[PDB]
Amino acid sequence: AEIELTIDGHKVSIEAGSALIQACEKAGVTVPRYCYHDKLAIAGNCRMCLVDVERAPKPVASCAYPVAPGMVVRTDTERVKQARENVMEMMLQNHPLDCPVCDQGGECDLQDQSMRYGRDRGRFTEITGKRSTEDKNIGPLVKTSMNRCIHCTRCVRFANDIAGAPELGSSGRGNDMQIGTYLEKNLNTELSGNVIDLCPVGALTNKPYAFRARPWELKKTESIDVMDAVGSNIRIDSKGVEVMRVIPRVHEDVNEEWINDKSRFACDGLKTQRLTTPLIRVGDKFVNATWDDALSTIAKAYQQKAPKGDEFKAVAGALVEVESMVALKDMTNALGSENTTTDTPNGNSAPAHGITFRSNYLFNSSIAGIEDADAILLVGTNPRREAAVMNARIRKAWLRQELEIASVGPTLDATFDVAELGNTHADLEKALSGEFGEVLKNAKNPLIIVGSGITDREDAGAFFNTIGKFVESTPSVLNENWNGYNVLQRSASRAGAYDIGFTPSDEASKTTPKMVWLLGADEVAASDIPADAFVVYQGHNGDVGAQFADVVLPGAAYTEKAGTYVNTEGRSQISRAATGPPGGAREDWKILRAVSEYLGVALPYEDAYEVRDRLAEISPSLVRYDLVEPTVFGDVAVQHSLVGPNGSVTPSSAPLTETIENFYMTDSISRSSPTMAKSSIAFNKDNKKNQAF
Amino acid sequence: TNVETVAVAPTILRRGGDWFASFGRERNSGTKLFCISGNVNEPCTVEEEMSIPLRELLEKHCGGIKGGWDNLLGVIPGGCSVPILPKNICEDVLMDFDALKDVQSGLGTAAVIVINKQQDVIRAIQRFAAFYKHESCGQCTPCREGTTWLLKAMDRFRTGQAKEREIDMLYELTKDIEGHTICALGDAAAWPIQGLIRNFRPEMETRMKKFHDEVGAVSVGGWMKDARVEKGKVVGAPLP
Amino acid sequence: VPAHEIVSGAPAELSRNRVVRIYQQAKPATQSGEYGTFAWRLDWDIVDVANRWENDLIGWQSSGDYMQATQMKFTSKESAIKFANKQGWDFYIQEPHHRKFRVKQYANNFVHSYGKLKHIRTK
Amino acid sequence: KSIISYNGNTIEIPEEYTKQAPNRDSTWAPAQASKTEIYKNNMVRFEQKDLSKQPMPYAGIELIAQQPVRFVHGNTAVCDGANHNGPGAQGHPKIFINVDAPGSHACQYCGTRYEKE
């Protein structure tokens, strides 16, 4: 229960056993700190957080001192001021005079706490000078300047405890103690870039970003990452027309304050390979063209081609926003087509988990649900690639409580112990009828995590049948307080696509289209497009589909528009445009509105308010931002969508394979990024830099 | 626990608590091993009652200070971590915790180290500073940086390449480390310096005069008017 | 709600075709200080055509949006909403996110493990 | 020499004015516009103008590459870029460079290279 103490005269009540710095923070008292961080284990090595406690004779470390009832604490005594000056004096004596060349300058806690709590001038003029440190190479993402290191050990605690990358540590002793790997090893983890945020000083910096900006010259915009389906909340720092960097912001229910390396470093893909003017194919070459020319060409191809019903096929890629998908579907329906497909394998057919209830394709346990887990079954899913921050969440839960994790599918390099039950559907049948099935039956908060990659299999229904039967039986897995059935999407647009029903009709998957419209669709193959088909590509980068196209239309990227995205949780989130689109590119829903007017079927909304209206018409949860609400239809959905229609499906003998071959390049932006290509070569498994033994 | 507190325990239990209490004064009772080292005629290791006078301990176990009690500069009672005793306090001081604490030192591990008038106390304290710089684990900033700064200052004080006010600064420097660290190695590192300043300031002032007459005029940090940076190095100065 | 729009002298387009955002600054990920996170900022969403473009002479960034650098500070979300209504500004409120509290204990770094260690803590 | 314009016509420029600096032919930064691109994008304002009068500063990267490595005994070289002839503080902030790793190591401020020996 909560106990009560006094800090600087004020009365504060805090849960028993919490650290004194937590009570100080709760009571609105500011305490300087370096090594303490809310998300890392307490260290107490920097000594900046000293306070006086009447029982204590000497000042105590606030970050590590447990609160007690009736405690009397003073943060403002002359002894405390003196101690702050003493500690800052000792911290600055070997620190390098690097501020003009250091990337931390202007957003540096050492600078700021020197100004607030330190002496105005130093006393250290020794003629033997300062200690110097070797620099260390830990890969192409994190540049090191280790003279600046103040030995707070935040990087080590993050790399060990949170990301599960034990290669980082501290070697030597005393004055010669050094953070590093003791020999040339990459800091090899998809979460590595977070250490740049955690380093209080410029010791670990963003290597692609180096020297390009100072913090005071950056416009800051709160927006949403679209590199995966987690929907991490981010701050985009831009200057003028270009985006400089991407940093996490706190959302304790989504990414908590981390992002993965793709979300952080694929931003440089937004300034290269961009689509800036409409293109028209003439022979074997593209030619630049006006918007009027290109839209007219689309209209003439439609008149000539004359698609009937489902000969107009629409395909939505991994990165598109909901408004664009809604406009594309409305225009496609007004053309008489029901052929609105997704860009994934077998996305010509409808998904086998169904579209009727949201709880059939979502993470029904919230992301925060993973904190309560006692047993987890992973089915055809490698979270470390599909949702990196959620993988970190699973590891944190595993480290702090007993929890049993098993998986059916490819062997995965995991940051937590996993029980491999085999790679086949027969293995799943055995498991759910065996010991781990019993584990799930007995647990208080079980959850089964199904990957979006199983949906893309032909035999998908088989799997969704098996799981479904099990779920319909086990009350611990599905009851009125807890839904443990979870589908983990990998692409930021899939949950919203299913939300608006961007799904083909049964007869539409039979037809051979004469006209194909790709909306950010760069997973398409040669096979998926008929040769006679007239192909329109709408996007922001030139990767694959643009190469397949007859007419190319430049659209805005996610940093250039205020879009809606639905994450795996079913959470509807709204982004903010940092910059405008380059050149002659356009907001994508406006593109669709114009082209529908060229096609006769001119859509009924030309304004942003009207588009948000239409969205509310389609689904009321798309306009209710940052909210998660449970389904009342949890039992109906499982029977009606997973167990019902999937009886006839015959399971294949083919083993489950890894869904994403390369974590670093998955969509058009990441495949346009020089940083992602460098990192893909640098962090490969067969490279000794990534091999501890 | 220490090995001597554990090793005496069965004898204590056999012979009774009152008997062990009978040796040494109140609150300093029993018999401790007293290793004696340094500038005594005969170094030794032996056990004795607590509260024994220092003069008597020396004369009767170790053959006395090399040169006689006139030739004694100081004594460190207990190991290097405790502040050194000047010549005129050990004539009256008892080898307890209470008596040593009252004169602002301690028993420590009862490791006596005597220093006669032929040796340099400044060099000995400099060596202790070097030891503490080498033995810091490096976890906490006040110790990890302060021990190195203390060693640099003591290297300059050894030759006299420093200004007199810097002594006060050195004193303040020890207070940066004392009471601010995770463990008590930092306090141990601060204490011998403080004993040195308190007891032998004029020694340091004499060495400073010797340098200033001998070599030249020195600025804070040990710089001098001909000293500057050249092609990677500092030239124009001794560089302790 | 008094329509002070019509007495300020501002352009009509400001209360017709512009949207503002009302929010609190997020705690920066780079620093531990929270001094800038309590105020309620009001600022304008960007306009696509007028936001920023490259000058062909020297390379400076030109702009046609006269609000691009303006940011109002309010002591409460309610004061900001009141002001925005009094100016006829269409707005969106972004509710702030805060760190969920949990109990942290230094001693937890040394808890005895009865089975196989899940990881080696290093300090 | 001959640069093809967006018009499709030819711009002639003497070879020596296509060099990024008199002491260097190519760019030394990814964001740096080359002389050829500058003329292609700004030729209107270069017509009836004398290129030989335009500013042509020497590239500092080659000049610093010409300076010999300084060899140092210990683990740490110290640099401040001071002017020993003038009074006052005329160099850069005094920094310490670690030379334990193989090869030469550059001063962050002035580019002077140090090496252990």
Ligand code: SF4
């Ligand atoms: S880390 Fe901070 S104090 Fe150190 S050089 Fe960089 S900006 Fe300056």
Ligand code: SF4
């Ligand atoms: S590199 Fe940065 S985060 Fe790591 S110990 Fe040094 S100062 Fe702390």
Ligand code: SF4
């Ligand atoms: S005081 Fe103790 S914990 Fe701190 S650096 Fe020195 S030896 Fe390590």
Ligand code: FES
């Ligand atoms: S924050 Fe408490 S000692 Fe570092």
Ligand SMILES: [Zn+2]
């Ligand atoms: Zn230099």
